Amino acid sequence: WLGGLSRAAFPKRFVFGTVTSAYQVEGMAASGGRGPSIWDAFAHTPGNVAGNQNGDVATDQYHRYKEDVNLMKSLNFDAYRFSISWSRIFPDGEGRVNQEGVAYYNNLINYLLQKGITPYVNLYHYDLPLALEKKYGGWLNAKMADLFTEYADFCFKTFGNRVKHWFTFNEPRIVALLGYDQGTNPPKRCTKCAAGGNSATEPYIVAHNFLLSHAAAVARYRTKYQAAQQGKVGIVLDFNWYEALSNSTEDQAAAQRARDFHIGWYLDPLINGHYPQIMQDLVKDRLPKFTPEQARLVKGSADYIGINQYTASYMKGQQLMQQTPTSYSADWQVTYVFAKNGKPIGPQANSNWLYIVPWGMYGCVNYIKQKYGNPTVVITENGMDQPANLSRDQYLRDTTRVHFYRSYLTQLKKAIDEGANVAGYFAWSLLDNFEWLSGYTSKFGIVYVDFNTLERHPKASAYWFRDMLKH
Ligand SMILES: OC[C@@H]1[C@@H](O)[C@H](O)[C@@H](O)c2[nH]cc[n+]21
Ligand SMILES: [Zn+2]
């Protein structure tokens, strides 16, 4: 049932944790002095989320955080990845501090440390203060580097004597893709969209500003706080694996373009100080140019790379064509394929995009090892979902999730035993929670949350982790 996995199967002092994000678990969305984020406005508009649900209450971790910390300690985890809500600290994103918000994160951080659990703190997880969206146009505006740097500075000052493991952003690719290419997440921008936009240009502007903002915040950390605090700052990037459908030159090149457009988009700047060459060749003057000084600030600005790894796809190629620009997604010039030799790549979880493909974990980790000089990587999310409307006991008997983690972690072990510099692994999620457009219809937790009573109940997968992680 453990399949030979234990702490002895991973490197000495490998970090095991679970993950949430602020809007997905906290609740108290319009209480405790918190200002609205772009997701509050989006979720409150009829038809945007499944069942018109929102994160007003969520799991109510805001009031129950000590229960949840005790629970993660009893399951033998070493660390907890959570995010700080920018609008809980600065209701307008700038100016006035909400002291009640500050006290909440102080209390959470202090309790975690009291119970021997290491906090890994994300500054941003999709939840841009609405005031900054309206006043500045959000991530389309280069001024976000200053605005984010001032917010990060406050967080380093206020929490950094205790917090030593920071991330700036969670998955800027998804913000760019869903917010500005397809227009399905806030601010709902795209070429077609009612709010305006341009799917060929805005995704690249947004990504550039995430990178400049990350670099500016880290430069602030390094010049003002690191000497005294001695912590680290990284960034979280999504990476799903792409496998060539066949060994042809065409299909191998398609898979590699997909890798470069997905992960290279951010990794090449963070490691090598430039965008991928293929992106420069295909996107051209729609891709912003780093000045030498900006490139030098961005290069080497992550002390570790967070990887959110879930799934994999086959990629099929074609001849590279001259084309009128339409979108970030169309720029790749690839065809997604989800079967090979008459067999699917894997079975799906509840989320249509989530194909259960354990060898993709090996694919991603090995690729980053071999291509980017083996940087320090943390697996910052990995997990799968159950559907809505099951009984409690059905949720608890999550044998598919047990199998998911045994398989994926075996594949992670394989990459590490071959020399990949992976420092940690974090399971998405500690709790069933608000799953963005799916609302409460998608259950990612190792702990079940009854959303009528808010009671927590560990699933078999939680007990699997407890067995596997015991000292
Ligand atoms: O879809 C499940 C989870 C979300 O709940 C997280 O917020 C997000 O970080 C993410 N990226 C990939 C998968 N997921
Ligand atoms: Zn409450």
Author numbering: 6 to 476
Give the exact sentences the study uses for this entry:
Among all the plant enzymes, one of the most well-studied enzymes is rice (Oryza sativa L.) Os3BGlu7 β-glucosidase, originally designated as rice BGlu1, which was identified as a highly expressed iso-enzyme in rice flower and geminating shoot. Rice Os3BGlu7 and a set of closely related plant enzymes including rice Os3BGlu8 and Os7BGlu26 and barley HvBII were found to have both β-glucosidase and β-mannosidase activities. Most β-glucosidases are thought to catalyze hydrolysis through a two-step retaining mechanism involving two catalytic carboxylate residues (two glutamate residues for GH1 enzymes), one of which serves as a general acid/base catalyst and another as a nucleophile.
Since the Os3BGlu7 was reported to have a 4400-fold higher affinity (lower Ki) for GIm in comparison to MIm, <0.1% of GIm contamination in the MIm preparation can logically explain this observation. The GIm was bound in the −1 subsite and formed hydrogen bonds with Os3BGlu7, including N175 and E386 at O2H, Q29, H130 and W441 at O3H, Q29 and E440 at O4H, E440 at O6H and E176 at N2. The conformations of the GIm is consistent with the 1S3 → 4E/4H3⧧ → 4C1 conformational itinerary proposed for β-d-glucoside hydrolysis by Os3BGlu7 and other retaining β-glucosidases. In contrast, MIm is displaced by a slight contaminant of GIm in the crystal structure. Our MD simulations showed that, indeed, unlike the mannoside-preferring Os7BGlu26, which binds MIm through intermolecular interactions similar to GIm in the glycone-binding site, the glucoside-preferring Os3BGlu7 prefers to bind in a relaxed E3/4H3 conformation in the active site entrance. This suggests that the energetic cost of distorting MIm to the B2,5 conformation for optimal binding in the −1 subsite is not sufficiently compensated by the −1 subsite interactions, while binding with relaxed configuration in the active site entrance is more energetically favorable.
